[PDB]
Coordinates of C-alpha atoms and ligand atoms in Angstrom, one line a residue:
Chain D
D1 CA 101.7 -74.7 -187.9
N2 CA 102.8 -75.6 -191.4
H3 CA 99.7 -77.8 -192.1
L4 CA 97.0 -75.9 -194.0
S5 CA 93.4 -76.6 -194.8
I6 CA 93.0 -75.6 -198.4
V7 CA 89.7 -75.4 -200.4
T8 CA 89.3 -75.7 -204.1
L9 CA 86.6 -76.0 -206.8
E10 CA 86.4 -78.0 -210.0
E11 CA 86.7 -76.0 -213.2
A12 CA 88.8 -77.4 -216.0
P13 CA 91.5 -76.7 -217.0
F14 CA 92.4 -74.9 -213.8
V15 CA 91.1 -77.6 -211.4
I16 CA 90.3 -81.1 -212.8
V17 CA 88.8 -83.8 -210.5
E18 CA 89.3 -87.5 -211.0
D19 CA 88.5 -90.6 -209.0
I20 CA 91.3 -92.5 -207.2
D21 CA 93.1 -95.1 -209.4
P22 CA 91.0 -98.2 -208.9
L23 CA 94.0 -100.6 -209.0
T24 CA 96.2 -98.9 -206.4
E25 CA 93.4 -96.9 -204.7
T26 CA 95.8 -94.0 -204.5
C27 CA 96.2 -90.8 -206.5
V28 CA 98.5 -91.4 -209.5
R29 CA 101.4 -89.0 -210.3
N30 CA 100.5 -85.6 -211.9
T31 CA 97.6 -85.5 -209.4
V32 CA 97.2 -84.6 -205.7
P33 CA 94.7 -86.1 -203.2
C34 CA 91.5 -84.1 -202.6
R35 CA 88.4 -85.0 -200.6
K36 CA 84.8 -84.2 -201.4
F37 CA 82.0 -84.4 -198.9
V38 CA 79.2 -86.3 -200.7
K39 CA 75.7 -86.1 -199.4
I40 CA 73.6 -89.2 -198.7
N41 CA 70.5 -87.4 -200.1
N42 CA 69.1 -83.9 -200.6
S43 CA 67.1 -84.3 -197.3
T44 CA 70.0 -84.5 -194.9
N45 CA 73.4 -83.0 -193.8
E46 CA 74.6 -86.5 -193.4
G47 CA 77.3 -87.4 -195.9
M48 CA 80.6 -89.2 -196.5
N49 CA 84.0 -87.8 -197.3
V50 CA 85.1 -89.4 -200.5
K51 CA 88.7 -89.5 -201.6
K52 CA 89.3 -88.0 -205.1
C53 CA 92.3 -86.8 -207.1
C54 CA 92.8 -83.3 -208.3
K55 CA 95.0 -81.8 -211.0
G56 CA 95.2 -78.8 -213.4
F57 CA 96.8 -75.4 -213.8
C58 CA 96.1 -74.1 -210.3
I59 CA 96.9 -77.5 -208.7
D60 CA 100.4 -77.1 -210.2
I61 CA 100.5 -73.6 -208.7
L62 CA 99.6 -75.2 -205.3
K63 CA 102.5 -77.7 -205.6
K64 CA 105.0 -74.9 -206.5
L65 CA 103.7 -72.8 -203.6
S66 CA 103.9 -75.7 -201.1
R67 CA 107.5 -76.4 -202.3
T68 CA 108.6 -72.8 -202.3
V69 CA 106.8 -71.4 -199.2
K70 CA 107.3 -74.7 -197.4
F71 CA 104.0 -75.9 -196.1
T72 CA 101.8 -79.0 -196.3
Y73 CA 98.1 -79.1 -196.9
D74 CA 94.8 -81.0 -196.9
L75 CA 93.0 -80.1 -200.1
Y76 CA 89.2 -80.4 -200.2
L77 CA 86.5 -79.5 -202.7
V78 CA 83.8 -76.9 -201.8
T79 CA 80.3 -78.4 -201.6
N80 CA 78.0 -75.4 -200.8
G81 CA 78.2 -72.9 -203.6
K82 CA 81.0 -72.4 -206.1
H83 CA 83.5 -69.6 -206.2
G84 CA 81.9 -67.3 -203.7
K85 CA 78.6 -65.5 -203.4
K86 CA 77.2 -63.3 -200.6
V87 CA 73.6 -64.6 -200.1
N88 CA 71.7 -62.4 -197.6
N89 CA 75.1 -61.2 -196.3
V90 CA 76.3 -64.8 -195.8
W91 CA 79.1 -66.1 -198.0
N92 CA 79.1 -69.5 -199.7
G93 CA 81.6 -71.2 -202.0
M94 CA 85.3 -71.0 -201.6
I95 CA 85.1 -67.5 -200.1
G96 CA 82.8 -68.8 -197.5
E97 CA 85.2 -71.5 -196.5
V98 CA 87.9 -68.9 -196.0
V99 CA 85.9 -66.2 -194.2
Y100 CA 84.4 -68.6 -191.7
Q101 CA 87.9 -70.2 -191.1
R102 CA 87.3 -73.7 -192.3
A103 CA 90.1 -73.1 -194.8
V104 CA 93.1 -70.8 -194.6
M105 CA 93.6 -70.8 -198.4
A106 CA 91.4 -71.1 -201.6
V107 CA 93.1 -72.2 -204.8
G108 CA 91.3 -72.2 -208.1
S109 CA 89.7 -70.1 -210.8
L110 CA 88.9 -67.5 -208.1
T111 CA 88.4 -64.0 -209.5
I112 CA 89.7 -61.1 -207.5
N113 CA 87.0 -58.4 -206.9
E114 CA 86.4 -55.6 -204.4
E115 CA 83.5 -57.3 -202.5
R116 CA 85.5 -60.4 -201.7
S117 CA 88.6 -58.3 -200.9
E118 CA 86.8 -56.7 -198.0
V119 CA 86.5 -60.1 -196.3
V120 CA 89.5 -62.0 -197.5
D121 CA 93.1 -61.1 -198.5
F122 CA 94.0 -61.9 -202.2
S123 CA 97.4 -62.8 -203.5
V124 CA 98.8 -61.0 -206.5
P125 CA 96.9 -62.2 -209.6
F126 CA 98.6 -65.2 -211.2
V127 CA 96.5 -65.2 -214.4
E128 CA 94.6 -62.3 -216.0
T129 CA 90.9 -62.4 -216.6
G130 CA 87.9 -60.2 -216.8
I131 CA 84.8 -59.8 -219.1
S132 CA 85.6 -60.8 -222.6
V133 CA 83.6 -61.6 -225.7
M134 CA 83.6 -64.7 -227.9
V135 CA 82.2 -64.7 -231.5
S136 CA 82.4 -66.8 -234.6
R137 CA 85.3 -65.9 -236.8
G138 CA 84.4 -63.0 -239.1
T139 CA 82.2 -61.1 -236.6
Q140 CA 83.4 -57.6 -235.8
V141 CA 83.0 -56.4 -232.3
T142 CA 85.3 -54.5 -229.9
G143 CA 84.3 -55.6 -226.4
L144 CA 81.7 -55.4 -223.7
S145 CA 81.4 -51.6 -224.1
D146 CA 80.7 -51.9 -227.8
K147 CA 77.6 -49.9 -228.8
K148 CA 76.4 -53.0 -230.6
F149 CA 76.0 -54.4 -227.1
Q150 CA 75.1 -51.2 -225.2
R151 CA 72.4 -50.2 -227.7
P152 CA 71.4 -53.5 -229.4
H153 CA 68.4 -52.0 -231.2
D154 CA 70.5 -49.4 -233.0
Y155 CA 71.3 -52.2 -235.4
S156 CA 69.3 -54.4 -237.7
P157 CA 69.4 -57.2 -237.0
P158 CA 70.3 -56.8 -233.4
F159 CA 73.1 -59.0 -232.0
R160 CA 72.0 -62.2 -230.3
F161 CA 74.4 -62.3 -227.3
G162 CA 74.2 -63.5 -223.8
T163 CA 76.0 -65.0 -220.8
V164 CA 75.5 -67.7 -218.2
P165 CA 73.3 -66.0 -215.6
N166 CA 73.6 -65.9 -211.8
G167 CA 77.4 -65.3 -211.8
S168 CA 79.8 -62.4 -211.6
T169 CA 79.4 -61.6 -215.2
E170 CA 75.7 -61.0 -215.1
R171 CA 76.0 -59.0 -211.8
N172 CA 78.6 -56.7 -213.4
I173 CA 76.6 -56.0 -216.6
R174 CA 73.5 -55.4 -214.5
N175 CA 75.3 -52.7 -212.6
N176 CA 77.2 -51.1 -215.5
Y177 CA 74.9 -51.5 -218.6
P178 CA 71.3 -51.9 -217.3
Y179 CA 69.6 -52.0 -220.8
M180 CA 72.2 -54.4 -222.1
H181 CA 71.4 -56.7 -219.2
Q182 CA 67.7 -56.4 -219.8
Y183 CA 68.2 -57.2 -223.5
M184 CA 70.6 -60.1 -223.1
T185 CA 68.6 -62.1 -220.5
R186 CA 66.5 -63.6 -223.4
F187 CA 69.8 -65.2 -224.6
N188 CA 70.8 -66.7 -221.2
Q189 CA 72.9 -69.8 -221.6
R190 CA 72.7 -72.8 -219.3
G191 CA 76.4 -73.3 -219.4
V192 CA 79.7 -72.6 -221.3
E193 CA 79.4 -75.7 -223.4
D194 CA 75.8 -74.8 -224.4
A195 CA 77.0 -71.3 -225.5
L196 CA 79.8 -72.7 -227.7
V197 CA 77.3 -75.0 -229.5
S198 CA 74.9 -72.0 -229.9
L199 CA 77.8 -70.0 -231.3
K200 CA 79.0 -72.6 -233.7
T201 CA 75.5 -73.4 -235.0
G202 CA 74.4 -69.8 -235.7
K203 CA 71.9 -69.6 -232.8
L204 CA 74.0 -67.0 -231.0
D205 CA 76.2 -64.2 -232.2
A206 CA 78.3 -63.5 -229.1
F207 CA 79.1 -65.1 -225.7
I208 CA 80.1 -62.8 -222.9
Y209 CA 82.0 -64.5 -220.1
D210 CA 85.3 -65.0 -218.1
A211 CA 88.2 -64.0 -220.3
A212 CA 90.5 -66.8 -219.1
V213 CA 87.7 -69.4 -219.8
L214 CA 86.9 -68.0 -223.2
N215 CA 90.6 -67.8 -224.3
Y216 CA 91.1 -71.5 -223.3
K217 CA 88.0 -72.6 -225.2
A218 CA 89.0 -70.6 -228.3
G219 CA 92.5 -72.0 -228.2
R220 CA 91.2 -75.6 -228.5
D221 CA 88.1 -75.0 -230.6
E222 CA 87.8 -77.4 -233.5
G223 CA 88.3 -75.8 -236.8
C224 CA 89.2 -72.8 -234.6
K225 CA 86.0 -71.1 -235.6
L226 CA 85.4 -69.4 -232.3
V227 CA 87.6 -66.3 -231.4
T228 CA 87.9 -63.8 -228.6
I229 CA 88.6 -60.1 -228.6
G230 CA 92.1 -58.8 -228.1
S231 CA 93.4 -58.7 -224.5
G232 CA 93.4 -54.9 -224.7
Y233 CA 89.6 -54.7 -224.9
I234 CA 88.9 -57.0 -221.9
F235 CA 86.4 -55.2 -219.7
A236 CA 87.0 -54.8 -215.9
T237 CA 90.5 -56.4 -216.1
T238 CA 91.3 -58.5 -213.0
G239 CA 92.8 -61.9 -212.3
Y240 CA 92.6 -65.2 -210.6
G241 CA 94.1 -65.0 -207.1
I242 CA 94.8 -67.1 -204.1
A243 CA 92.3 -66.2 -201.3
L244 CA 93.6 -66.1 -197.7
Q245 CA 92.1 -65.1 -194.4
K246 CA 92.3 -61.4 -193.6
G247 CA 95.7 -60.5 -192.2
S248 CA 97.1 -63.9 -193.2
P249 CA 100.8 -64.4 -192.3
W250 CA 101.1 -66.4 -195.5
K251 CA 100.2 -63.6 -197.9
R252 CA 103.6 -61.9 -198.3
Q253 CA 105.6 -65.0 -199.1
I254 CA 102.9 -66.4 -201.4
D255 CA 102.9 -63.0 -203.2
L256 CA 106.7 -63.1 -203.6
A257 CA 106.6 -66.7 -204.8
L258 CA 103.9 -66.0 -207.4
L259 CA 105.8 -63.0 -208.6
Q260 CA 108.9 -65.2 -208.8
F261 CA 107.0 -67.8 -210.9
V262 CA 105.9 -65.0 -213.2
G263 CA 109.4 -63.5 -213.7
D264 CA 111.4 -66.7 -214.0
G265 CA 109.4 -68.4 -216.7
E266 CA 107.7 -71.0 -214.4
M267 CA 104.3 -69.4 -214.9
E268 CA 104.6 -69.4 -218.7
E269 CA 105.5 -73.1 -218.7
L270 CA 102.3 -73.9 -216.8
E271 CA 100.3 -71.7 -219.3
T272 CA 101.9 -73.7 -222.1
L273 CA 101.2 -77.0 -220.3
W274 CA 97.5 -76.3 -219.4
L275 CA 96.2 -73.2 -221.2
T276 CA 97.7 -72.6 -224.7
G277 CA 95.9 -74.3 -227.5
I278 CA 96.3 -75.0 -231.2
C279 CA 94.3 -72.0 -232.3
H280 CA 95.8 -68.5 -232.2
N281 CA 93.3 -65.8 -233.3
Chain M
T1 CA 100.1 -33.6 -194.1
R2 CA 99.9 -33.7 -197.9
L3 CA 100.8 -36.9 -199.6
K4 CA 104.0 -36.6 -201.6
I5 CA 103.3 -38.2 -205.0
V6 CA 106.3 -39.0 -207.3
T7 CA 105.7 -39.8 -210.9
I8 CA 107.6 -39.9 -214.2
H9 CA 107.1 -38.6 -217.7
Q10 CA 105.6 -41.5 -219.7
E11 CA 102.9 -40.8 -222.3
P12 CA 100.0 -41.5 -222.4
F13 CA 100.1 -42.2 -218.7
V14 CA 101.8 -38.9 -217.7
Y15 CA 102.0 -35.9 -219.9
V16 CA 104.4 -33.1 -218.8
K17 CA 103.7 -29.7 -220.3
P18 CA 105.0 -26.2 -219.3
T19 CA 102.7 -24.0 -217.3
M20 CA 101.2 -20.8 -218.8
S21 CA 102.7 -17.4 -218.0
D22 CA 100.6 -17.0 -214.8
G23 CA 101.7 -20.4 -213.5
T24 CA 98.4 -22.2 -214.3
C25 CA 97.6 -25.0 -216.8
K26 CA 96.0 -24.4 -220.2
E27 CA 92.3 -25.5 -220.1
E28 CA 91.7 -28.4 -222.5
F29 CA 89.0 -30.9 -223.4
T30 CA 89.3 -34.2 -225.1
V31 CA 88.1 -34.6 -228.7
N32 CA 84.9 -36.2 -227.2
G33 CA 84.2 -33.3 -224.9
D34 CA 85.7 -34.5 -221.6
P35 CA 87.7 -31.9 -219.5
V36 CA 91.4 -32.8 -219.3
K37 CA 92.2 -32.7 -215.6
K38 CA 95.6 -31.2 -214.9
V39 CA 97.7 -30.9 -211.8
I40 CA 100.8 -28.9 -211.0
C41 CA 103.9 -31.1 -210.9
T42 CA 107.3 -29.8 -209.9
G43 CA 110.3 -31.2 -211.7
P44 CA 113.9 -30.7 -212.9
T45 CA 112.9 -27.0 -209.5
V46 CA 110.3 -25.6 -212.0
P47 CA 106.5 -26.1 -211.8
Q48 CA 104.9 -27.9 -214.7
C49 CA 101.5 -29.3 -215.6
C50 CA 100.9 -33.0 -215.5
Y51 CA 97.9 -35.0 -216.9
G52 CA 97.1 -38.3 -218.4
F53 CA 96.0 -41.9 -217.4
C54 CA 97.7 -42.0 -214.0
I55 CA 96.9 -38.4 -213.1
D56 CA 93.2 -39.2 -213.7
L57 CA 93.8 -42.2 -211.4
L58 CA 95.5 -40.1 -208.8
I59 CA 92.6 -37.7 -208.7
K60 CA 90.1 -40.5 -208.4
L61 CA 92.1 -42.0 -205.5
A62 CA 92.5 -38.7 -203.7
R63 CA 88.7 -38.0 -203.7
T64 CA 87.7 -41.6 -202.9
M65 CA 90.0 -41.9 -199.8
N66 CA 89.8 -38.1 -198.9
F67 CA 93.5 -37.1 -199.1
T68 CA 95.4 -34.2 -200.5
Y69 CA 98.6 -34.5 -202.5
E70 CA 101.5 -32.7 -204.1
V71 CA 103.0 -34.1 -207.3
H72 CA 106.7 -34.0 -208.3
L73 CA 108.6 -35.7 -211.1
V74 CA 111.3 -38.2 -210.1
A75 CA 114.6 -36.4 -209.7
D76 CA 116.8 -38.8 -211.6
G77 CA 114.2 -39.6 -214.3
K78 CA 114.3 -43.4 -213.7
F79 CA 111.7 -45.9 -212.6
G80 CA 114.0 -47.7 -210.2
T81 CA 116.5 -50.6 -209.9
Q82 CA 118.7 -51.8 -207.1
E83 CA 122.4 -51.0 -207.4
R84 CA 125.5 -51.9 -205.3
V85 CA 126.9 -49.0 -203.3
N86 CA 130.5 -48.8 -204.4
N87 CA 133.2 -49.9 -202.0
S88 CA 130.4 -50.9 -199.6
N89 CA 127.9 -53.7 -198.9
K90 CA 124.7 -51.8 -198.9
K91 CA 122.4 -51.8 -201.9
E92 CA 120.2 -48.8 -202.7
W93 CA 117.4 -48.2 -205.1
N94 CA 117.4 -45.4 -207.7
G95 CA 114.5 -43.8 -209.6
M96 CA 111.1 -43.7 -208.0
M97 CA 111.8 -46.8 -205.9
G98 CA 114.6 -44.9 -204.1
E99 CA 112.5 -41.9 -203.5
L100 CA 109.6 -44.0 -202.1
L101 CA 112.0 -45.8 -199.7
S102 CA 113.8 -42.6 -198.8
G103 CA 110.7 -40.7 -197.8
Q104 CA 111.0 -38.2 -200.6
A105 CA 107.7 -39.7 -201.8
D106 CA 104.8 -41.3 -200.0
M107 CA 103.3 -42.9 -203.0
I108 CA 104.4 -43.8 -206.6
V109 CA 101.7 -43.0 -209.1
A110 CA 103.1 -44.0 -212.5
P111 CA 103.3 -47.0 -214.9
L112 CA 105.3 -48.8 -212.3
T113 CA 105.7 -52.5 -213.1
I114 CA 105.0 -55.0 -210.4
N115 CA 107.8 -57.5 -210.0
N116 CA 109.3 -59.7 -207.3
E117 CA 112.4 -57.5 -206.9
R118 CA 110.5 -54.4 -205.9
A119 CA 107.8 -56.2 -203.9
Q120 CA 110.5 -57.4 -201.5
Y121 CA 110.8 -53.8 -200.3
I122 CA 107.6 -52.0 -201.1
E123 CA 103.9 -52.8 -201.2
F124 CA 102.1 -52.9 -204.6
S125 CA 98.5 -52.2 -205.1
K126 CA 96.4 -54.6 -207.2
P127 CA 97.2 -53.8 -210.9
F128 CA 95.4 -50.8 -212.3
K129 CA 96.6 -51.8 -215.8
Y130 CA 97.3 -55.2 -217.3
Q131 CA 99.8 -55.2 -220.2
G132 CA 103.2 -56.6 -221.2
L133 CA 106.4 -56.3 -223.0
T134 CA 106.8 -55.8 -226.8
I135 CA 109.2 -54.5 -229.4
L136 CA 109.0 -51.2 -231.2
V137 CA 110.8 -50.7 -234.6
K138 CA 110.7 -48.2 -237.4
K139 CA 108.5 -48.9 -240.3
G140 CA 110.8 -50.8 -242.7
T141 CA 112.5 -53.0 -240.1
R142 CA 111.3 -56.6 -240.2
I143 CA 111.9 -59.0 -237.3
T144 CA 109.9 -61.9 -236.0
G145 CA 109.9 -60.6 -232.4
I146 CA 111.7 -61.7 -229.2
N147 CA 113.0 -64.9 -230.8
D148 CA 114.7 -63.3 -233.7
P149 CA 118.2 -64.2 -234.9
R150 CA 118.9 -60.5 -235.1
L151 CA 118.1 -60.3 -231.4
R152 CA 119.2 -63.8 -230.2
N153 CA 122.6 -63.5 -232.1
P154 CA 123.3 -59.8 -231.6
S155 CA 125.9 -57.7 -233.3
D156 CA 126.8 -54.0 -233.7
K157 CA 124.8 -54.1 -237.0
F158 CA 121.3 -54.3 -235.4
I159 CA 121.2 -52.2 -232.2
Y160 CA 118.4 -52.9 -229.8
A161 CA 118.0 -51.8 -226.2
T162 CA 115.6 -50.7 -223.4
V163 CA 115.5 -48.0 -220.8
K164 CA 118.2 -48.0 -218.1
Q165 CA 117.2 -48.7 -214.5
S166 CA 113.7 -50.0 -215.4
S167 CA 111.6 -53.2 -215.1
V168 CA 112.9 -54.4 -218.5
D169 CA 116.5 -53.8 -217.4
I170 CA 115.8 -56.0 -214.4
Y171 CA 114.1 -58.7 -216.4
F172 CA 116.9 -59.3 -218.9
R173 CA 119.8 -59.3 -216.3
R174 CA 118.2 -61.7 -213.7
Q175 CA 117.6 -64.4 -216.4
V176 CA 120.6 -66.6 -217.3
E177 CA 118.7 -67.5 -220.5
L178 CA 118.9 -63.8 -221.6
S179 CA 122.6 -63.2 -220.8
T180 CA 123.6 -62.9 -224.5
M181 CA 120.8 -60.4 -225.2
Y182 CA 121.5 -58.4 -222.1
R183 CA 125.2 -58.0 -222.9
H184 CA 124.2 -56.3 -226.2
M185 CA 121.5 -54.3 -224.4
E186 CA 123.6 -52.9 -221.6
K187 CA 125.9 -51.0 -224.0
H188 CA 122.9 -49.3 -225.8
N189 CA 120.2 -48.8 -223.1
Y190 CA 118.7 -45.3 -223.1
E191 CA 118.1 -42.9 -220.2
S192 CA 114.4 -42.5 -221.1
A193 CA 111.6 -44.1 -223.1
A194 CA 111.2 -40.8 -225.1
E195 CA 114.9 -40.7 -226.0
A196 CA 114.8 -44.4 -227.1
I197 CA 111.6 -43.9 -229.1
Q198 CA 113.1 -40.9 -230.9
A199 CA 116.3 -42.9 -231.5
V200 CA 114.1 -45.5 -233.4
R201 CA 112.8 -42.5 -235.3
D202 CA 116.4 -41.3 -236.1
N203 CA 117.3 -44.9 -237.2
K204 CA 120.1 -44.9 -234.5
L205 CA 118.1 -47.5 -232.6
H206 CA 116.7 -50.5 -234.5
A207 CA 114.5 -52.1 -231.8
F208 CA 113.1 -50.9 -228.5
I209 CA 111.9 -53.5 -225.9
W210 CA 109.4 -51.7 -223.6
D211 CA 105.9 -51.6 -222.2
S212 CA 103.1 -52.5 -224.5
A213 CA 100.7 -49.8 -223.3
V214 CA 103.3 -47.2 -224.2
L215 CA 104.7 -48.7 -227.4
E216 CA 101.3 -49.5 -228.9
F217 CA 100.2 -45.9 -228.1
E218 CA 103.3 -44.6 -229.8
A219 CA 102.6 -46.6 -233.0
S220 CA 99.0 -45.3 -233.2
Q221 CA 100.3 -41.7 -233.0
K222 CA 103.6 -42.0 -235.0
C223 CA 102.8 -44.2 -238.0
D224 CA 106.5 -44.2 -239.0
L225 CA 106.8 -46.6 -236.0
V226 CA 105.3 -50.1 -235.5
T227 CA 105.4 -52.7 -232.8
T228 CA 105.8 -56.5 -233.3
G229 CA 102.2 -57.1 -232.3
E230 CA 103.4 -59.9 -230.0
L231 CA 103.4 -60.0 -226.2
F232 CA 106.4 -62.1 -225.1
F233 CA 105.9 -61.3 -221.4
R234 CA 102.9 -60.0 -219.4
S235 CA 103.1 -57.6 -216.5
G236 CA 101.0 -55.1 -214.6
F237 CA 101.3 -51.6 -213.3
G238 CA 100.6 -51.0 -209.6
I239 CA 100.6 -48.1 -207.2
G240 CA 103.8 -48.1 -205.0
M241 CA 103.7 -47.5 -201.3
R242 CA 106.0 -48.1 -198.4
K243 CA 105.7 -51.2 -196.2
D244 CA 102.7 -51.0 -193.8
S245 CA 101.4 -47.8 -195.2
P246 CA 98.0 -46.8 -193.9
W247 CA 96.6 -46.4 -197.5
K248 CA 97.6 -49.8 -199.0
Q249 CA 94.3 -51.6 -198.4
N250 CA 92.0 -48.8 -199.6
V251 CA 94.1 -48.0 -202.6
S252 CA 93.8 -51.6 -203.8
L253 CA 90.0 -51.7 -203.0
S254 CA 89.7 -48.4 -204.8
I255 CA 91.5 -49.8 -207.9
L256 CA 89.5 -53.0 -208.0
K257 CA 86.3 -50.9 -207.7
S258 CA 87.5 -48.7 -210.6
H259 CA 88.0 -51.8 -212.9
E260 CA 84.5 -53.1 -212.0
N261 CA 82.5 -49.9 -212.4
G262 CA 84.0 -49.1 -215.8
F263 CA 86.2 -46.2 -214.6
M264 CA 89.3 -47.8 -215.9
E265 CA 87.4 -48.5 -219.1
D266 CA 86.9 -44.8 -219.5
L267 CA 90.6 -44.2 -218.8
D268 CA 91.5 -46.7 -221.4
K269 CA 89.3 -45.2 -224.1
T270 CA 90.5 -41.7 -223.2
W271 CA 94.2 -42.2 -223.0
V272 CA 95.3 -45.7 -224.3
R273 CA 93.0 -46.8 -227.1
Ligands
N9A301 C1 84.3 -58.2 -213.9 C2 83.4 -59.4 -213.7 C3 84.1 -60.7 -213.9 C4 85.7 -60.7 -214.1 C5 86.4 -62.0 -214.3 C6 85.6 -63.3 -214.4 C7 84.1 -63.3 -214.2 N1 83.4 -64.6 -214.2 N2 82.3 -64.9 -214.9 C8 81.7 -66.1 -214.4 C9 80.2 -66.2 -214.1 O1 79.4 -65.2 -214.3 O2 79.6 -67.3 -213.8 C10 82.5 -66.8 -213.5 C11 83.8 -65.8 -213.4 C12 84.0 -65.5 -212.1 C13 84.5 -66.6 -211.2 N3 85.9 -66.9 -211.6 C14 84.4 -66.3 -209.8 O3 85.4 -66.2 -209.0 O4 83.3 -66.0 -209.3 C15 83.4 -62.0 -214.0

């Protein structure tokens, strides 16, 4: 069939979620319909499917893919988990929706990695990402592998740097740089917005996170005080990719369509439309 | 059977040096004390020694997935484009693409750019290196970059080109928005990146549009050269395999694993940065 269940996850500017237009009670132009299962309370599986309206960088990718590869879809937001985590060998998030066949496709800020690639097929990456570093303008650091991060107490004063815990960034640092992980947990940030405030107010020296997210934030930062390292020093370079069921018959044509979008300028136009900001390091 | 690896001379990803008298490779260590792993590569009929970024990757892939290999350099010295067969209908690929589709090679291990044109016929790994296109000039030449009047309004006074039968040659011919630039480029394109880089050093070539991971390495080694510092198009290198090859999945998983455990970080610090 050409009708596809597709799961997504809110993370601006890649996926932005709005309510239906109250006047028409439909999704306005620029946006596509998406449904979210909303719980009655935290003490039940009972809930109500609520109509919402989704837009953003990856939603525009989905529209291009649906037009080019010729398929229709029902888009819905994941409600258990976020991107995808294996908890006691059971997947949640968007990856969980794909592996357990509730969705044939996951569209969003979904990072390609080896663990997920053993249970889903990933399209070609459509934007690059990885582990990058954001600092206040004037701070000199190379990247995640900088000795100022690896051996923080070789310097006086030591760098105050951290990440948002419980995600792919913390897991990677924990495996690659154990002491750096042990050190930086004292500077754990509750969220991206918290970290930016801590950077701009001198409470934090560096923020280590998703490169695509950090580049977007730096491009629109006010006064352009926050900057990221160069793209050549991004650690563990990977990308956002479309997740599909293992052995999906949609993977090849989706790969060819994405590579077409990259080569013919359509991809750069979406980057200009959604990702590029005033600031330019 | 041994896997037939095709590659191409492209520093710092593939160095090609002559063997010693006894047919072996001179033992070397990096300035930081790491052993430089070298393999024998046959090329144009004569054995030579190959090493560098992609050779380090090939060794890691061979031991991870437990396969043996033999390395040879691409016979025609090109990466690979599709050309019409004269007085015929068929199209054929040249360069490493043709050798992979012919069976002369089982796997391409080189700075092979992933694009839609090649992915129609072969399977690409996940990218082992993210980079892009930039412009290399000689120190003393001043241009804004890709959107320069000297490049947008070409003439025989400012000669710019790329490598024939390459990803960049594909990129500028397929786009109707680049038809004026490509017409200037097709009468000046060089057979190799090395010949084009030296031409910028002999002031015969004034600009060279090529891969950033190569051009930026060239600027850091030959300070009489300099790049724009701009990335006007981003692309990735991938391992090339035939359709439905038995190694596709584990090569991609191996590469993703190498990015995540810092192995590619080590390759970058050793060869690129
Ligand atoms: C090499 C490790 C790495 C490479 C590229 C991105 C990240 N990320 N860091 C975040 C976090 O730790 O919460 C979220 C994001 C992952 C998120 N897109 C996802 O798909 O899980 C980690």
